[PDB]
DNA sequence: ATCGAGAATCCCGGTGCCGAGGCCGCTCAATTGGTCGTAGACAGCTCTAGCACCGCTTAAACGCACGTACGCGCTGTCCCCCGCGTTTTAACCGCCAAGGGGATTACTCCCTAGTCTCCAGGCACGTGTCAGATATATACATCCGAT
DNA sequence: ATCGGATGTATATATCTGACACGTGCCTGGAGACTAGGGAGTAATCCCCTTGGCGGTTAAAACGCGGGGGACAGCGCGTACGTGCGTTTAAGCGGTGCTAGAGCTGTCTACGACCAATTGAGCGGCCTCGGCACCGGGATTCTCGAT
């Protein structure tokens, strides 16, 4: 099934999985990748972008776009968990 | 004058994707595809009859030719569709 | 002035020509070649216009598939540059 | 005539084939290969045409030639 | 009535029987053979057009075109296995780059 | 019970190309396989040609064509010459 | 009646024009089979058969055997370009392969 | 009444030196030790396809015995036509 | 006096000359036949084989692997290796279109 | 580098055997030799689509420069695989036994070729709407120094 | 590593045209209702070839042990091909117009399916002997560690 069916997903900064793997996961889950800071439903990175509060993640914060770890998509693929749990039990940002 | 499969293809398209249409080139490819698969199954059904000295292609030569030509789940599902159809047709 | 590095535009071209479906050889010189080759097996021929289109679709598809096999042979040799020996290998494995 | 298959036209084909870098000896090699490929398809298609007593080669003549060589081409049939 | 309607098929059972006889595939053709064959052709037709319409819907386009047939047939393992040597006019090829060819 | 094979005609042809030479039963079995394969290729192609042109009859013309398609180059020209020479003799 | 005369003997063939005509009908290849067709086909089968046995007997002579065996058929076929082209996807039982080592594999 | 116990692991019956002998006939001078399991994989895939088709010709005939003709027809339709067992 | 030893690859060449000259079936008959029965029982239980049907299966298999090894050998030589390796088999099969 | 052992190969020749060539019955399938219906060879007509050729546009092919990253020849070194001696295990061969099932014959009846009559399906061909091709401006996605 | 610039890309919005979806008339092929004869489903019998099994020999497999030569990493450098510009040419287009020849039509006759009576040709079996295989011993080739 495709949980991200209509959703836009921003990728920021360093990732352990490469860009094409994260894009392939977004596609397999039905969502759309972007690089634009202010129009996504979810933002994705390692801890680094929120840990630094990088200028691009400050735009994500002022947009109130909730942030998930790179590996939190692995659970979105691997389990039956609800979207809210995947964005609350799994979250990086204090905003959302 | 010039027969084809095009309207039956279109009726199948209306069953699987009601909103969808099909370009003339794509419809020409479906006519090509249906004729190829038909020639494969009929050729192999013929060869099955000759190896067994049978005069007749029955539903069973078709079923075997299909089990030979198709891979895996296409083969299993195709045989089920043939079984369903001949069952339904019989009454 | 600005400049892309070697191989960057080649990758940009791979993405482009894999995304499109148009025939890649100019029509008229391909048609002209077909006439020369045919003229030896019989003089005074004519072609349906669609028949030359079928030949172009065949030749382009065959050459593209051969170039994919050729690409593997160069990669196997740890090259990225294809060379005539790669074509000759691929064709000999195919048994052409 | 075969040199009318231009250098960039062969590059475009190699690009569709995913090829990144191309040693220049490939163009003349590919022209050779293509001429062999066309000779066998045309000779078979022309044989079907001439068998049928036609002078005009049909799309079907090409399709049958390709089909007997197993390079089965849909869309013209 | 019609043999297609007794079979519940959209495919043309009557035509299929006539083509089986006229092709010289055998001396005789039993009444169940064209029913089974029409069912199999209809199923495979639906199995391709299922995927082709999904490929079209993946994209924005609403009518199937040769590109969509090629992408469907090559993405599916079993159709690609069934149609390995077939060329589709105006198909192009799968988007596919070997990883060795990329930067870094 | 009664089988049939090409074996005696294979043997006659052998005596004509090489008078002194004999042939093994396995080699003879291979020739019977080969003769049947080539017969089925030619007859199969001649069927397609007839069908494609709406002709109901396979004739010498369909065979002569099927041979130019199936055989390579010089092997084809000789086979076509042999087929021709045999039919003109048989016409007498 | 006149004395019976085989169609093979009219054609000057060893191959059985009668059996070939039978098989062309019973193999369902067409509705009808024209009277020259089995002669033409028999001549072609005979020519190819003679063409193989020609080369096979030569290979057996070169290998100093009076009897053709499957090995000589394989060697004779792979030694002729048009036969190997005609038979490129055929396996010969008991054939083995051409004697062939790639030149780079030999000692310096 | 009788039966035989199910056969196991007979793919390792294809001995290391048997694979070496095949490669020697194939003109191979030196063999990396990783080739043997890969070769067994390929041979098993080949045999699965040929047997599946041959068994299907046997089933079609309503026979229980697989014949040389069942095998020859399988190989023929797979484009690996074998002479020496037909006729 | 040191024992006589051929240098490496020298006996391998002699084996190639031997096994290309001969027509023997190179796989042990009985283990090949057990493998056939072992595979076959996945499609239909309690099958039987004509003895010649097993011979035909072996002749096919030996020819198939020998041919694949020739293509594998070309792939190794093209990479400037003398040694065949699993990537050669994977390449040869992919260019043949067996995968 | 050219030169002695020595190891495997290729080469005589006596044996002795079983697979191939030949010969004989004889069953049946090929031929001889008569209809007759129709496939298809041939003649005529017609109209369409392939070839020819024309002038203009502008996309594409070409030729040139240049530099960088690739191919690749070179060296080291590390370990794998080959070659060779020993142990062992199972393949192989002969021969034994039972009986599954493959091959064959014979019946009889289901069904499918075949004819005739009927009509609805599906084709050829009109036609109007709207999917998507072509801009056209726009807001990215990602590459390349420069830090 | 970040960051700015740039520039190639994919994205909204707008038109607009020609391709496809639908509607129509009709004509021919499927389908309904027969008929009838032969294809193949089922029984029954036979015997053959398959599967199981046993004991003995010895060929091949598995194994262990060196050690040298091959894979492959690293790397120095010569050059050949990628990216980009200015140049030029020939592909494309949309035009016209011609006419060969693909296509349908109508006739009629050459031949090939058909039947049946007839007989030699090819197959199934029994031989018997000579081409081959098999050692046994022999000379020749080619390799290797000397030099």
What domains does chain F contain, in order, with CATH numbers? 1-92 (1.10.20.10)
Burial of E22 (0-12, 13-18, 19+ CB in 10 A): exposed
For C19, the token pair is: 């995304």
Burial (0-12, 13-18, 19+ Cβ within 10 Å), F2: exposed
Q: What is the resolution of this structure in A?
A: 3.5
Per-domain residue ranges of chain C: 1-96
Cβ–Cβ below 8 Å for H60 and B60:
yes
- Compute CA distances C45 → C40, C80, D61, F62, I26, whole Å: 10, 43, 13, 21, 55
E4, exposed or middle or buried, with CB in 10 Å at 0-12, 13-18, 19+? buried
Measuring CA to CA, how many Å separate A1 from each of A8, A27, A77, E75, I18?
A: 17, 12, 9, 18, 60
Q: For I76, phi and psi rounded to 5 degrees?
A: -65, -50
| Closest chain D residue to the Cα of E96, Cα to Cα | D18
Q: Show Cβ contacts of residue H61 under 8 Å, excluding neighbours closer than 6 positions.
A: B51, B52, H70
CA distance F3 to F7: 11
Q: Which nucleotide has the least CA–C1' distance to G18?
A: J30
Directed axis angle between helix D25-51 and helix C27-41, to 10°?
Answer: 60
Contact across the interface for C14 and E97, Cβ inside 8 Å = yes
| Contact (CB<8Å) H27/G90 | no
Class for domain C1-96, per CATH? mainly alpha
Cβ contact I98:H45 at 8 Å: no
In this complex, which of E11, E32, E89 lies closest to B29 when CB atoms are compared? E89
Give the pair of three-digit tokens for residue F86.
Answer: 């045999």
- Interchain touch D–C (≥3 Cβ pairs closer than 8 Å): yes
The experimental method, as deposited, was cryo-EM
Domain range annotation of chain A: 1-96
F11, closest nucleotide (Cα–C1'): J21
Take residue A74 and report the two structure tokens written for it: 């692995």
Phi-psi region of I57 (alpha: psi -120 to 50; beta: other; left: phi over 0): alpha
DSSP state of E104: -
Distance (Å, rounded) from C-alpha H32 to C-alpha F42? 45
H62 touches chain I (CB under 8 A): no
Q: Architecture of domain I1-99 in CATH?
A: Orthogonal Bundle (1.10)
User: Subunits that touch chain D (at least 3 Cβ pairs < 8 angstroms)?
Assistant: B, C, E, F
Query: Which of I9, I20, I59 is facing G97, going by the closest CB pair?
Result: I20
Question: Residue I99 gets which letter from DSSP?
Answer: -
Pairing of strands B56-57, D56-57: unpaired
Q: Across-strand partners of I48?
A: H65
**What 3-state DSSP class applies to E86?**
coil
Torsion of CA F39, F45, F51, F57, to 10 degrees: -40
**CB of residue G1 closer than 7 A to nucleic acid strand J?**
yes
Helix (H), strand (E) at residue E29: strand E28-29
Q: In angstroms, how far is K36 C1' from E31 CA? A: 18
CB F25 within 7 Å, strand J:
yes
The three state secondary structure string of chain F is: CCCCCCHHHHHHHHHHHCCCCEECHHHHHHHHHHHHHHHHHHHHHHHHHHHHCCCCEECHHHHHHHHHHHCCHHHHHHHHHHHHHHHHHHHC
How distant is C1' of K144 from CA of I6, in Å?
7
Instruction: Tell me whether residue I28 is exposed, middle or buried, using C-beta atoms within 10 angstroms of its C-beta: 0 to 12, 13 to 18, 19 or more.
Output: middle
Q: Which of F52, F61, F62 minimises the CB distance to D64?
A: F52
I89/C80 Cα distance (integer angstroms): 20
Pairwise CB contact (< 8 Å): B59 & E36: yes
Chain B: closest CA distance from residue G94 (Å) = 25
Distance (Å, whole) CA C54 – CA D58: 10
The CATH number, out of the four listed (1.10.357.10, 3.40.50.300, 3.40.250.10, 1.10.20.10), of the domain defined by the range G6-108 = 1.10.20.10
- In this structure, is the CB of residue E32 within 7 Å of any atom belonging to strand J? yes
B:51-90 residues touching chain E, CB 8 A cutoff:
54-59, 61-63, 66, 69-74, 77-78, 81-82, 84-86, 88-90
Residue G89: which of H25, H29, H79 has the nearest Cβ? H79
CB D28 within 8 A of CB C82: no
Chain I nearest-CA distance from G85, in A, is: 16
CB–CB of H71/I56 below 8 Å?
yes
Q: Residue E28: closest CA among chain G residues belongs to which residue?
A: G28
Residue F49 and residue F64 in contact, taking contact as beta carbons nearer than 8 Å: no
Q: Do chains D and G touch (3 or more CB pairs under 8 A)?
A: no
Please write down the long-range contacts of E67-74, taking CB distance under 8 Å and 24 or more positions apart.
E67/C21, E67/E91, E67/E92, E68/B26, E69/B26, E69/B29, E70/E94, E72/E48, E73/E48
I69-81 in b/e form (b: 16+ CB < 10 A) is bbbbbbbbbbbeb
Task: Sort out which chain E residues have CB atoms less than 8 A from F47's CB and list them.
Answer: 24
- Decide: G66 and F21 in contact? Cβ < 8 Å: yes
CA–CA separation, G9 vs G16, rounded Å?
9
**Domain E2-104, what architecture?**
Orthogonal Bundle (1.10)
Nucleic acid strand J: bases within 7 A of protein CB: 6-10, 19-21, 27-33, 39-41, 49-51, 60-62, 67-72, 80-85, 90-93, 100-105, 111-113, 121-124, 131-133, 139-145
Which residue in B26, B72, B77 is closest to E64 by CB distance?
Answer: B26
Class of domain H8-87: mainly alpha
Q: Count of CB atoms within 10 A of residue E87's CB?
A: 21
Q: Is beta strand E28-29 parallel, antiparallel or unpaired with respect to A42-45?
A: unpaired
Check if the beta carbon of residue A23 is closer than 8 Å to that of residue A48: no
Gap between the Cα atoms of C26 and C29, Å rounded: 6
| D76 contact B CB<8A | yes
Distance (Å, rounded) from C-alpha A4 to C-alpha I64?
A: 48
**With a 7 Å cutoff on the CB, does I46 touch strand J?**
yes
From the options 1.10.1740.10, 1.20.1260.10, 1.10.20.10, 3.40.30.10, give the CATH code of D1-77.
1.10.20.10
Among chain C residues 51-80, those with CB within 7 Å of any atom of strand K:
none
Distance CA G71, CA F26 (A): 10
End-to-end CA distance of chain C: 48
The reply to whether H44 Cβ lies less than 7 angstroms from strand K is: no
Cβ contact G91:H83 at 8 Å: yes
- The DSSP result for chain G, as a single string, is -PPP--HHHHHT-SS-HHHHHHHHHHTTS-SEE-TTHHHHHHHHHHHHHHHHHHHHHHHHHHTT-SEE-HHHHHHHHHHSHHHHHHTTTEEETT--------GGGS--
């Amino acid at each position: 099934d495709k949980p991200l069916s209509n959703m836009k997903i921003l990728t920021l900064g360093k990732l352990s999985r490469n860009k094409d793997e994260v894009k392939a996961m977004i596609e397999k889950l039905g969502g759309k990748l972007t690089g634009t800071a202010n129009k996504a439903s979810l933002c994705i990175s390692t801890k680094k972008e929120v840990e630094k509060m990088n200028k691009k993640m400050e735009e994500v914060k002022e947009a109130n776009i909730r942030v998930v770890s790179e590996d939190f998509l692995q659970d979105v693929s691997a389990s039956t968990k609800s979207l809210q749990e995947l964005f609350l039990a799994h979250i990086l940002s204090p905003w959302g | 004058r010039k027969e084809s499969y095009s309207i039956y293809v279109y009726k199948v398209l209306k069953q699987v994707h009601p909103d969808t249409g099909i370009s003339s080139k794509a419809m020409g490819i479906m006519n090509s595809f249906v004729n190829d698969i038909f020639e494969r199954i009929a050729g192999e059904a013929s060869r099955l009859a000759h190896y067994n000295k049978r005069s007749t292609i029955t539903s069973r030569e078709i079923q075997t030719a299909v089990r030979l030509l198709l891979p895996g789940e296409l083969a299993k599902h195709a045989v089920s569709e043939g079984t369903k159809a001949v069952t339904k047709y019989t009454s | 002035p600005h400049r892309y590095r070697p191989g960057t535009v080649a990758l940009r071209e791979i993405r482009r020509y894999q995304k499109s479906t148009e025939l890649l050889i100019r029509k008229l010189p391909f048609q002209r070649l077909v006439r020369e080759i045919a003229q030896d097996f019989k003089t005074d021929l004519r072609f349906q216009s669609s028949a030359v289109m079928a030949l172009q679709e065949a030749c382009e598809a065959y050459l593209v598939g051969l170039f994919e096999d050729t690409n593997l042979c160069a990669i196997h040799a740890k090259r990225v540059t294809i060379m005539p020996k790669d074509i000759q290998l691929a064709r000999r494995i195919r048994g052409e | 005539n075969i040199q009318g298959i231009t250098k960039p036209a062969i590059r475009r084909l190699a690009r569709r084939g995913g090829v990144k870098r191309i040693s220049g000896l490939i163009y003349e090699e590919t022209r050779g290969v293509l001429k062999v490929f066309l000779e066998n398809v045309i000779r078979d298609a022309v044989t079907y045409t001439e068998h049928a007593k036609r002078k005009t080669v049909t799309a079907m003549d090409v399709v049958y030639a390709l089909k007997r060589q197993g390079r089965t081409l849909y869309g013209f049939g | 009535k019609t043999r297609s309607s007794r079979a519940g098929l959209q495919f043309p059972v009557g035509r299929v029987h006539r083509l089986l006889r006229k092709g010289n595939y055998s001396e005789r053709v039993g009444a169940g053979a064209p029913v089974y064959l029409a069912a199999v052709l209809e199923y495979l037709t639906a199995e391709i057009l299922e995927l082709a319409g999904n490929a079209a819907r993946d994209n924005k386009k609403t009518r199937i075109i040769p590109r969509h047939l090629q992408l469907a047939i090559r993405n599916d393992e079993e159709l690609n296995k069934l149609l390995g040597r077939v060329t589709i006019a105006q198909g192009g090829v799968l988007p596919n780059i070997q990883a060795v060819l990329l930067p870094k």
